[PDB]
Design a protein around this ligand. Structure first.
Ligand SMILES: O=C(O)Cn1cc(Br)cn1
Ligand SMILES: O=C(O)Cn1cc(Br)cn1
Ligand SMILES: O=C(O)Cn1cc(Br)cn1
Lengths: 302, 262
């Protein structure tokens, strides 16, 4: 692809992960500010990590204004540099630093609408994210929000096959995964966004569990313990146990009291137990909750 | 329901159709290969079938690997003593992409019987990535077959397995199958299996989705029916062995039709 390391100037470190360090960087010829994710392959006697193969292969084909753009890949013998579009902040830091009295309802609507666009786009292209949480949603100065971190993403077939069970950060993880179901689909990313929607309203995670069984229990205490009526097949699921306490479902008015009828309607459809009835991103874009979103769709960049 | 992605299957189908054209190997690549032949490639792919079986890999992984190999050999000229190395790195890559639990590089080194070092496998991995520009999310026959299967009324596991079998046979023989798109081979495979097992034909509903007809699918279908008929005689037998297994409903033991009445 276009680039080499000689044309970038490092500005500061901005994060890290498995792969290694991320830097804010400046293209010395064009002026473009980028994020450079370094992957070390020399320490890797397992070759190029699968996480990076998926991240690159899948992001190459996902050009959408609400998906962080992979601009280039610089492939040395020794190292691998992913050049990304730069965005100054994530939703977690925003909600933790500037949203202490709250995120205003206009900005929530806008964010959720944009997130749904990006997600629908992923699902339209055979791609599950499997790691949607505030930390992985980058915001820029223009008010765009974008899906990031495809390290845990996966190309799916139709219908889906059994994929990895260790998927999704626990607080954001769908009941169907927690219950060890053989198959999971696009509804798991919708669950995550449901959790995030609630989080944006309250500035606190909706299901903050410390264990898989605690995560389930917290979910059940909010949405009621699922039975055959609400979720056919539930009581046959591999890690479903008859012993599960049977908590009553509570009114969504109590789950997120500041939310209005439209918001509560959308949220409930995002958090439906049965994955088959859970709303799709594509359908959710038309929900009345969004009737008054004003933001010009962001532009897809080069 | 959601596992068959009702709200996205069309978008995905359409997107795979576009991609299969982008990921297509050069049909004439083998004549321009000075030192390798269709026969060598058949040997290789048959070996990859065995490797897949040995490490209990997904069949998707197999199709992906063959896709990487054919694209690779479309731009890169390879001596016969290195073809296996290309194939090995392809299988590694596909494994890392598609498998929950990919085999280790050492296992890939081991299956080559010390022909190649770990360093050579990893260097070739890098080369293949370079050559394909990390474009690894390739449409496969399987990705089309599984969608077509949703149009069976009702589902037959013998039909589904037989179709898989036929599609896999197609991977072995670059002539003629390099000239057909995954979606077309899958269409032929599906029709042939359905005819073989239930006597029925390529459904109207699949014409409405693919735009394909028995007419449009006829060239491939004639080639595929020959491959099915001559399969017990082929030099390469690993697919037939694999599909005797109960896992795939012993479908390699079914008798091909003598005619298609097309
Ligand atoms: O990675 C290197 O050693 C070279 N380089 C770093 C930046 Br930021 C831009 N170029
Ligand atoms: O033994 C050779 O050099 C020829 N050959 C290589 C493969 Br892989 C298959 N045939
Ligand atoms: O079967 C083996 O273990 C050796 N082999 C490699 C190829 Br290509 C074909 N045979």
């Amino acid at each position: 692809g276009p680039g080499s390391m000689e044309n970038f100037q490092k500005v500061e470190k901005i994060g890290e992960g498995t792969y290694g360090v991320v830097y804010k960087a400046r293209n010395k010829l064009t002026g473009e500010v980028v994020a450079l994710k370094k992957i070390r392959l020399d320490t890797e006697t397992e070759g190029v990590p699968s996480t990076a193969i998926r991240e690159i292969s899948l992001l190459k084909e996902l050009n959408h204004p609400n998906i962080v753009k992979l601009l280039d890949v610089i492939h040395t013998e020794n190292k691998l540099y992913l050049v990304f579009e730069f965005l100054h902040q994530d939703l977690k830091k925003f909600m933790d630093a500037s949203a202490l009295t709250g995120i205003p309802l206009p900005l929530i609507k806008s964010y959720l609408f944009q997130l749904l666009q990006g997600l629908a786009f992923c699902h339209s292209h055979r791609v599950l994210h499997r790691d949607l949480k505030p930390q992985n949603l980058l915001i820029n100065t223009e008010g765009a929000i974008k899906l990031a971190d495809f390290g845990l993403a996966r190309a799916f077939g139709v219908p889906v096959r059994t994929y990895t069970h260790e998927v999704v950060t626990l607080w954001y993880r769908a009941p169907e995964i927690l219950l060890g179901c053989k198959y999971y689909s696009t509804a798991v990313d919708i669950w995550s966004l449901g959790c995030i929607f609630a989080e944006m309203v309250t500035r606190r995670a909706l299901f903050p569990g410390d264990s898989e069984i605690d995560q389930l229990f917290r979910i059940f205490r909010t949405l009621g313990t699922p039975d055959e009526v609400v979720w056919p097949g539930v009581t046959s699921m591999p890690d479903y146990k008859p012993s599960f306490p049977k908590w009553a479902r509570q009114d969504f008015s109590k789950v997120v009291p500041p939310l209005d009828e439209d918001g509560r309607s959308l949220l409930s459809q995002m958090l439906h137990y049965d994955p088959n009835k859970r709303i799709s991103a594509k359908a959710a874009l038309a929900h009345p909750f969004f009737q008054d979103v004003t933001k010009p769709v962001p532009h897809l960049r080069l | 329901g959601v596992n068959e992605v009702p709200d996205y299957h069309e978008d995905i189908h359409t997107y795979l159709r576009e991609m299969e054209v982008k990921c297509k190997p050069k049909v004439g690549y083998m004549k321009k290969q000075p030192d390798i032949t269709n026969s060598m490639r058949a040997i290789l792919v048959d070996w990859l079938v065995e490797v897949g079986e040995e490490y209990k890999l997904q069949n998707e992984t197999l199709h992906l690997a063959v896709n990487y190999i054919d694209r690779f050999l479309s731009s890169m000229s390879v001596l016969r003593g290195k073809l296996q190395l290309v194939g090995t790195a392809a299988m590694l890559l596909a494994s890392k992409f598609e498998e929950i639990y990919p085999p280790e590089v050492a296992e890939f080194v081991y299956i080559t019987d010390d022909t190649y070092t770990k360093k050579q496998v990893l260097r070739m991995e890098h080369l293949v990535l370079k050559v394909l520009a990390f474009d690894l999310a390739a449409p496969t026959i399987n990705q089309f077959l599984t969608q077509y299967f949703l149009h069976q009324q009702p589902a037959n596991c013998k039909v589904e397995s037989l179709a898989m079998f036929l599609g896999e046979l197609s991977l072995i023989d670059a002539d003629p199958y390099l000239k057909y798109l995954p979606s077309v081979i899958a269409a032929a495979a599906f029709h042939l299996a359905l005819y073989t097992v239930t006597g029925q034909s390529w459904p109207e509903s699949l014409v409405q989705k693919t735009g394909y007809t028995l007419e449009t699918l006829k060239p491939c279908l004639l080639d595929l029916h020959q491959t099915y008929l001559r399969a017990p005689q082929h030099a390469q037998q690993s697919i037939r062995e694999k599909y005797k297994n109960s896992k795939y409903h012993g479908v390699s033991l079914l008798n091909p039709p003598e005619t298609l009445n097309v």
